[PDB]
Amino acid sequence: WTATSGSCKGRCFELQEVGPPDCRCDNLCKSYSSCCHDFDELCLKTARGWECTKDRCGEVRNEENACHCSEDCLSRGDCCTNYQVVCKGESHWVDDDCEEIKVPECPAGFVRPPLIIFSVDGFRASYMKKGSKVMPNIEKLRSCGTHAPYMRPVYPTKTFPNLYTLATGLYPESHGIVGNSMYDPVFDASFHLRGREKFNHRWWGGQPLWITATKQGVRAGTFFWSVSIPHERRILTILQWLSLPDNERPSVYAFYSEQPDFSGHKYGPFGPEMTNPLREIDKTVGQLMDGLKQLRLHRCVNVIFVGDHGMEDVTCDRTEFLSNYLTNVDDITLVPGTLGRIRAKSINNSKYDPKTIIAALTCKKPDQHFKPYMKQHLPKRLHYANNRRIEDIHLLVDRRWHVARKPLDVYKKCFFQGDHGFDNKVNSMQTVFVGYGPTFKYRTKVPPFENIELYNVMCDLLGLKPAPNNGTHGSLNHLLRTNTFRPTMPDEVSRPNYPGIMYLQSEFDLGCTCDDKVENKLEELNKRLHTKGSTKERHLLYGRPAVLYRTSYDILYHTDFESGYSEIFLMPLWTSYTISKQAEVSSIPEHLTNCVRPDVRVSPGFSQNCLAYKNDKQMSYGFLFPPYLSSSPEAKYDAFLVTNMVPMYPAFKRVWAYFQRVLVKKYASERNGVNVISGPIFDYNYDGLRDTEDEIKQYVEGSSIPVPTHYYSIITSCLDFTQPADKCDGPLSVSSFILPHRPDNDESCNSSEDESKWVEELMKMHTARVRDIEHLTGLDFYRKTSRSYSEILTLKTYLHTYESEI
Numbered sequence: 001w002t003a004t005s006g007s008c009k010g011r012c013f014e015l016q017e018v019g020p021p022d023c024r025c026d027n028l029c030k031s032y033s034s035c036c037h038d039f040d041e042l043c044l045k046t047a048r049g050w051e052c053t054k055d056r057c058g059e060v061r062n063e064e065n066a067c068h069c070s071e072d073c074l075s076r077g078d079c080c081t082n083y084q085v086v087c088k089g090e091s092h093w094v095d096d097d098c099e100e101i102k103v104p105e106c107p108a109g110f111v112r113p114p115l116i117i118f119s120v121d122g123f124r125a126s127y128m129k130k131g132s133k134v135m136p137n138i139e140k141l142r143s144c145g146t147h148a149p150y151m152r153p154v155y156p157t158k159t160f161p162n163l164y165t166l167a168t169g170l171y172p173e174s175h176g177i178v179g180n181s182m183y184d185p186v187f188d189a190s191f192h193l194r195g196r197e198k199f200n201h202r203w204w205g206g207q208p209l210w211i212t213a214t215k216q217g218v219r220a221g222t223f224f225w226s227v228s229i230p231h232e233r234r235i236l237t238i239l240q241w242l243s244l245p246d247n248e249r250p251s252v253y254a255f256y257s258e259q260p261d262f263s264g265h266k267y268g269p270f271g272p273e274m275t276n277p278l279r280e281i282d283k284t285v286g287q288l289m290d291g292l293k294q295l296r297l298h299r300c301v302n303v304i305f306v307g308d309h310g311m312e313d314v315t316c317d318r319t320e321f322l323s324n325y326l327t328n329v330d331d332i333t334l335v336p337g338t339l340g341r342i343r344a345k346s347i348n349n350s351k352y353d354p355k356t357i358i359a360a361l362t363c364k365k366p367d368q369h370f371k372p373y374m375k376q377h378l379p380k381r382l383h384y385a386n387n388r389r390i391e392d393i394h395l396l397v398d399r400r401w402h403v404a405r406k407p408l409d410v411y412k413k414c415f416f417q418g419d420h421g422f423d424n425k426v427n428s429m430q431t432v433f434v435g436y437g438p439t440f441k442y443r444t445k446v447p448p449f450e451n452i453e454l455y456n457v458m459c460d461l462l463g464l465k466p467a468p469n470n471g472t473h474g475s476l477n478h479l480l481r482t483n484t485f486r487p488t489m490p491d492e493v494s495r496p497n498y499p500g501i502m503y504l505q506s507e508f509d510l511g512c513t514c515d516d517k518v519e520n521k522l523e524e525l526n527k528r529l530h531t532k533g534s535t536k537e538r539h540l541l542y543g544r545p546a547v548l549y550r551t552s553y554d555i556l557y558h559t560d561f562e563s564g565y566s567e568i569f570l571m572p573l574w575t576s577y578t579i580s581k582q583a584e585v586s587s588i589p590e591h592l593t594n595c596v597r598p599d600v601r602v603s604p605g606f607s608q609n610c611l612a613y614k615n616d617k618q619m620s621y622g623f624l625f626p627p628y629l630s631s632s633p634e635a636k637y638d639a640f641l642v643t644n645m646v647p648m649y650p651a652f653k654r655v656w657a658y659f660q661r662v663l664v665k666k667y668a669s670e671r672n673g674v675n676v677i678s679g680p681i682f683d684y685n686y687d688g689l690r691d692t693e694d695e696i697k698q699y700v701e702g703s704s705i706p707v708p709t710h711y712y713s714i715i716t717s718c719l720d721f722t723q724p725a726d727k728c729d730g731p732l733s734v735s736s737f738i739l740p741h742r743p744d745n746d747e748s749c750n751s752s753e754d755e756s757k758w759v760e761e762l763m764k765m766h767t768a769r770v771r772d773i774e775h776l777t778g779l780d781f782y783r784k785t786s787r788s789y790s791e792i793l794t795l796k797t798y799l800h801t802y803e804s805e806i
């Protein structure tokens with residue numbers, strides 16, 4: 001119940017919201033059907049429109065008008081935004097030349113530059129170039145401020161998950177808004193775009209920017225606008241708040257627009273109907289900037305122009321139907337569209353089996369336009385599994401397609417030409433970032449980055465301590481003139497042991513054999529030098545990785561590679577080696593096919609054994625430093641050490657061997673040498689974080705050798721590829737991957753073909769940031785370089801996406 005008999009007089013767009021049954025007058029009262037009876041009359045005036053005209057100038061104030069052109073309007077804070085232009089001979093902001101804003105120029109009373117967020121729904125990154133002719137205000141923000149060519153949204157590339165990620169710095173799996181539609185099985189409740197359940201705070205986790213501000217004494221304008229409030233009224237409300245007394249005035253504001261998304265769904269991302277929506281959003285930016293100029297705030301405020309996701313061409317005819325795959329289609333509930341999520345229709349169904357559902361959806365039709373995954377097997381870069389609202393079965397839908405349960409859902413539930421939600425590396429899903437103001441840089445282009453990073457910077461802009469989030473604070477310091485955040489490197493928690501030769505060969509009873517007794521004062525000294533770290537500069541180019549948790553491990557040096565060997569997990573945490581452009585690939589010699597050799601520096605009790613692999617009929621082994629890239633026949637023996645061995649399913653060994661035998665040399669050739677760090681990852685609870693020993697669900701049969709869920713590589717070279725990776729004077733270049741360690745290649749529909757036709761495609765899908773590997777391993781990379789720490793943080797957030805140019 002709401003007592004709508006109360007009044008909005010002197011309360012229009014009040015900041016503090018009131019509780020039922022008292023009627024409301026805030027930004028969202030319409031969405032709750034709770035506005036006071038006179039809210040439209042008092043708060044939503046429209047008389048005479050939104051613009052001053054020459055005949056209105058100096059008018060007698062009429063309080064009924066939407067905005068004012070009377071001599072008193074500036075002191076009242078409610079002039080039409082073009083008042084000074086029409087009535088006082090001023091220029092529109094867009095018409096003024098860009099001039100660098102070196103320092104804030106703020107009116108007295110202003111404690112800090114205000115932050116104004118201008119959020120646009122469905123604004124695809126390429127509109128900034130493709131639409132620049134019809135968007136002169138936006139184009140001036142972009143050219144004169146700081147801009148990226150695009151900003152990467154989060155998956156799924158839907159509205160509510162991305163806007164809330166913008167606000168919180170969190171992945172959707174952490175903030176809880178994991179789709180526009182959700183079912184939470186603990187609450188037994190459903191969240192939908194339409195309706196009241198979505199207002200319950202239990203759905204909205206983390207801590208959004210307006211709550212971080214308010215908790216630390218910084219006042220915030222409300223970030224939400226009921227859809228029926230015209231954009232012109234939203235802008236005038238923001239400008240009116242900006243004229244409040246100092247102690248009442250907010251420091252952070254947001255505007256939101258439903259466009260260009262609304263028209264993009266109807267017309268497709270580049271439909272001829274799309275120009276007018278772009279012109280109108282531009283005109284709204286111009287209102288804001290003219291209004292700021294009137295308030296003398298246009299060289300004081302920092303403005304962020306930002307979108308949630310882009311827009312792809314999608315039509316009703318490009319829909320896959322699960323009814324063409326499943327015998328049992330009425331036993332499942334599908335959350336449909338540009339992603340699919342599947343759960344049982346009834347929890348009382350003992351006939352429900354996700355294994356038979358996955359198999360019936362796997363590579364069944366030659367041009368099949370979606371791929372099924374158990375969520376834990378989705379690319380780790382998506383960070384889309386650790387939430388009970390995310391269904392176990394996931395369908396990743398190809399760009400331009402939909403998935404639906406049955407045909408009748410598509411005509412009884414073509415209209416639309418555009419949609420979004422696909423994989424967040426897809427070019428059409430990328431969106432926009434421009435920052436303009438005293439705290440941003442002048443005429444500066446910055447490389448693409450992730451929307452999770454902005455919360456830290458907005459906190460930086462407002463003098464706030466950010467709540468814990470998934471940004472890497474400092475990785476965006478190059479966007480900023482001042483207010484940078486100067487992080488320190490984390491301290492190493494575990495120091496390594498450096499074992500020498502401590503065991504005789506006969507102390508080992510591992511069931512391994514090697515034809516190595518085929519093997520000199522000159523050159524024995526040399527091998528001793530290698531085992532003590534004499535080639536280590538060549539192979540560990542950025543320092544040893546620091547271990548940020550408590551564990552027991554050894555540094556092991558070799559001619560061709562260096563590793564940190566865990567005595568707890570019985571295998572390396574990391575293995576680091578450099579391959580020059582001139583490096584030669586060799587074979588594994590016939591007499592060494594089955595060679596595994598005890599490592600006389602590491603106890604038998606802290607070693608793997610061969611008999612366990614013999615006995616486990618599902619599990620084989622591979623090597624982290626590849627025997628194919630040995631520098632000499634004699635150095636090659638090192639590659640067969642029991643301390644370089646890792647458990648690998650035979651199907652996975654097809655992938656790994658092609659990566660090691662073929663692709664590393666190809667990258668060294670292309671990049672002018674590469675430094676590679678490889679290793680295992682254990683993430684059995686799919687939380688994106690390193691597992692402890694007691695979270696491991698699978699071991700090589702009969703042993704304490706834990707089985708990795710994934711294997712990573714970080715591949716680093718010189719950004720200036722005229723310099724070799726090992727003699728690089730300036731910035732670095734990196735690509736990395738986190739490959740799922742699976743017992744089949746069901747993910748790759750073409751895997752019966754030669755590895756050259758499918759492996760690199762798999763690896764591309766599983767591309768990763770170095771930061772993703774850090775979370776999954778508890779290791780900190782790039783500890784000793786010539787580079788600034790913020791530059792290294794940017795490097796660690798880089799994702800190599802393999803898309804063509806935006």
Ligand SMILES: *[C@@H]1O[C@H](CO)[C@@H](O[C@@H]2O[C@H](CO)[C@@H](O[C@@H]3O[C@H](CO[C@H]4O[C@H](CO)[C@@H](O)[C@H](O[C@H]5O[C@H](CO)[C@@H](O)[C@H](O)[C@@H]5O[C@H]5O[C@H](CO)[C@@H](O)[C@H](O)[C@@H]5O)[C@@H]4O)[C@@H](O)[C@H](O[C@H]4O[C@H](CO)[C@@H](O)[C@H](O)[C@@H]4O[C@H]4O[C@H](CO)[C@@H](O)[C@H](O)[C@@H]4O)[C@@H]3O)[C@H](O)[C@H]2NC(C)=O)[C@H](O)[C@H]1NC(C)=O
Pocket residue numbers: 170171173174175176202203204205206383386387388468469470687688689775
């Ligand atoms: C991205 O950044 C985010 C933010 O930094 C990272 O997420 C953090 O990761 C931490 C570890 O996973 C986690 O810390 C835990 O917090 C527990 C208390 O959590 C509550 O309080 C915080 C603070 O206000 C709050 O933010 C939490 O909010 C979560 O949960 C609510 C309700 O479900 C949601 O609305 C909200 O969206 C959020 O959910 C997300 O996180 C939870 C986990 O908290 C997931 O379940 C969800 O799926 C979703 O992803 C909470 O309200 C604290 O109690 C934990 O401690 C346990 O474990 C340790 C082991 O050392 C032990 O000391 C404790 O005893 C305890 O164990 C006991 O409980 C176990 C299970 O019941 C049981 O097995 C044991 O036997 C014990 O009894 C732990 O410290 C932190 O909460 C989240 N924060 C957020 C916002 O998500 C994220 O990791 C980053 N991602 C990457 C890839 O880097």
Ligand SMILES: CNC(=O)C[C@H](NC(=O)COc1c(CN(C)Cc2nc(C)cs2)cccc1OC)c1cccc(C(F)(F)F)c1
Pocket residue numbers: 031117119159160163164166167198199209223224225226227254255256258304306454
């Ligand atoms: C019909 N309109 C809609 O459906 C969307 C519209 N959204 C908004 O008015 C503001 O959008 C959001 C922002 C806004 N914020 C400004 C984006 C940010 N960008 C940065 C950079 C930080 S925060 C941040 C976080 C989540 C957001 O929405 C879920 C809306 C209208 C009515 C009610 C709701 C709700 F309560 F259900 F959520 C949502």
Ligand SMILES: [Ca+2]
Pocket residue numbers: 682683684685686687688689690691
């Ligand atoms: Ca884990």
Ligand code: NA
Pocket residue numbers: 612613614615616617618619620
């Ligand atoms: Na085996």
Ligand code: NA
Pocket residue numbers: 745746747748749750751752
């Ligand atoms: Na296959």
Ligand SMILES: [Zn+2]
Pocket residue numbers: 122159261262265420
């Ligand atoms: Zn949309």
